[model samples]
Target: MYLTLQEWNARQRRPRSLETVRRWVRESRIFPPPVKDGREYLFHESAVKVDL
Candidate 1:
């Protein structure tokens, strides 16, 4: 269960930077606080389905 910002943006059909989420996560604005590693969110399982 892994999700990267790259694929996430692609999934959402966004044209801007995945960096948008970077700001959100840094501010602790996201639910369950996505794991920070190797440029990936990696929220896993039902969490991913819940959010996106």
Candidate 2:
């Protein structure tokens, strides 16, 4: 499932700011780059599940 950065953060116990999450993406710290959708970034639910 695809989710916005804000939605993703909300699901997390320790939510992160978009700036920090964007930085992680730019630094290749998170697997599977987010999909650029208009003014938002979309991430896969599987990515978060895998991370944990």
Candidate 3:
């Protein structure tokens, strides 16, 4: 139920460009939803669902 960089890229249908990946990481933290740990950062396999 977790995702690695490659997995997320494949499902997203785009090359896992560094720029894009970096942006996603940055944005995931800034998401309007209450962020766990109260930090603007993400860790590998950080979630329980890829499509959640």
Winning candidate number (TM-score): 2
Candidate 3 residue lDDT tens string, 1-52:
3344545445654456756665555566322222334433333343322332
Error of 3 at 13 (Å): 2.8
Q: What is the Cα-based TM-score of model 2?
A: 0.70
**Residue-pair clashes, model 3:** 0
lDDT of each: 0.55, 0.72, 0.43
Candidate 2 residue pairs in backbone clash: none
Clashes of 1: 0
- TM-score per candidate, in order? 0.51, 0.70, 0.36
Weakest lDDT window of 10 consecutive positions for candidate 3: 29-38
lDDT of 2 at 49: 26
Q: Which of candidates 1 and 3 is the stronger one according to TM-score?
A: 1
* lDDT value, residue 42 of candidate 1: 61
Error of 1 at 25 (Å): 0.9
Q: Output the worst ten-in-a-row residue range by lDDT, candidate 1.
A: 43-52
Q: What is the Cα-based lDDT of residue 31 in candidate 2?
A: 58
